[PDB]
Design a protein around this nucleic acid. Structure first.
Length: 91
DNA sequence: AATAAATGGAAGTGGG
DNA sequence: TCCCACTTCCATTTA
């Protein structure tokens, strides 16, 4: 049962959806979603999870928000931009 | 207004 | 029982 932050890190490693997500500064772990193409990536997350409903970027971003306190992923002050923790990057 | 994004509480679902 | 790790729904706010 893959975790959302790992799904995203795995995508950034593989390059399979390079038009939906990309590194901004990979050394810092900052990454950004495509305004126009993020929904396709959200859809893939829902299908990988086997969720009942179609996944949307908004719901996926709601899940990302919950990582802010524990630290795996923090929202950066640029649109659609986030940052993985050093711990997540190391694994 | 139209569109997009952000904020985030609250309740529901999984699989322990 | 009761937390995990989200998912789903909704109202609101900002640009």
């Amino acid at each position: 049962k893959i975790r959302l932050y790992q799904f995203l890190l795995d995508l950034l490693r593989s390059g399979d959806m390079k038009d939906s997500i990309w590194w901004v500064d990979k050394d810092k772990g900052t990454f950004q979603f495509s305004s126009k193409h993020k929904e396709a990536l959200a859809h893939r997350w829902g299908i990988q999870k086997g969720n009942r409903k179609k996944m949307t970027y908004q719901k996926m971003a709601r899940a990302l928000r919950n990582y802010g306190k524990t630290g795996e992923v923090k929202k950066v002050k640029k649109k659609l931009t986030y940052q993985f923790s050093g711990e997540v990057l190391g694994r």
